[PDB]
Amino acid sequence: HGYIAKPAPSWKASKTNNWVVEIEPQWKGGWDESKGDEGLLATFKELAPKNNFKDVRSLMDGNPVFGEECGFTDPKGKPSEPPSDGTATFSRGIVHAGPCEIWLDDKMVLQNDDCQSAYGDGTQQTIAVFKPVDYSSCAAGGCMLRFYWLALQRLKGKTVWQAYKNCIPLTGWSHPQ
Ligand SMILES: [Cu+2]
């Protein structure tokens, strides 16, 4: 669970830290025979090439089983100012394994194969901070920040994929290019 909280999102229907969908793994393999978060990540790594995986945005965008574009967030909301410290801040700590990434329009500015280990302490109590995030491209016209997170979790011994998506419009100081 969680959303990028800084820069601040706007909400369409409800403020919520929920996933957009919770689905079976899309890649056939031995998810449930693996153990721990390490096993979930290793299964993902093993299956990704045969499934033509590039990045989470490519996996989710236009793929109906991943649900609504932008999740619960409103891309037509009031634009937020980029943070001045090269970060984005999550709403809580990160407590599920799996890859996540941040885009500013069509520029991927941050990516990690396991955001849980990279950006938090595995507790929901400690706020996760994404860094480095270079917002400079947003000067020309602002930008849409997009966050994608494919959380891997076991629910009663059964692996699921949870999709988290945010769209956060950001301000910019100069004309579009
Ligand atoms: Cu969760």
- Return d(Cα 68, Cα 55) in angstroms, integer: 18
Amino acid at 6: K
Q: Which residues pair with 111 in a beta bridge?
A: 101
| 69: three-class secondary structure by DSSP | coil
Terminus-to-terminus CA distance in the chain, angstroms?
36
- Spacing, Cα 163 to ligand 1 middle (Å): 10
Beta-carbon neighbours within 5 Å of ion ligand 1: 1
The residue written with tokens 């520029």 in the block is 107
**What is d(CA 117, CA 32) in angstroms, rounded to the nearest whole number?**
21
Tell me if residue 115 falls in helix, strand or coil: helix
- At how many Å resolution was this determined? 1.0
**HSE-up of residue 10 (Cα within 13 Å, Cβ side):** 13
Are 56 and 115 a contacting pair, CB within 8 Å? no
- CB contact burial 27-47 (16+ within 10 A = b; e otherwise): beeebeebeebebbbebbeeb
How close is the Cα of 60 to the center of ligand 1, in Å? 18
Cα 85 to averaged position of ligand 1 atoms, centre (Å): 27
In the reported structure, the alpha carbon of residue 151 is separated from the centroid of ligand 1 by a whole-number distance in angstroms of: 8
User: What's the rounded Cα separation, in Å, for the pair 64 and 60?
Assistant: 8
C-alpha to C-alpha distance for 114 and 170, rounded to whole angstroms: 26
How far does residue 19's CA lie from ligand 1's centre (Å)? 7
R_g (Cα) of the chain, nearest Å: 16
- Return the SS3 of 89: strand
**Which tokens hold the place of 119?**
């950006």
- Alpha helices (H) in 9-150, listed in sequence order: 36-47, 56-60, 115-119
Two tokens at 53?
């995986």
Asked whether 152 and 159 are in contact (CB, 8 A), the reply is yes
CA of 2 to the centre of ligand 1 (A): 7
- Of 63, 64, 143, 161, residue with least CA distance to 102: 143
Could you tell me the distance, in angstroms and rounded to a whole number, from the CA of residue 141 to the centre of ligand 1?
34
Name the H helices within 66-146.
115-119
22: exposed, middle or buried (Cβ count in 10 Å: 0-12, 13-18, 19+): middle
Tell me how far apart the alpha carbons of residues 162 and 148 are, in angstroms, rounded to a whole number. 11
Using the Cα atoms of residue 71, residue 171, residue 81 and residue 174 in order, give the sign of their dihedral: positive
Residue 1 known to bind ligand = yes
Element (H, E) at 113: none
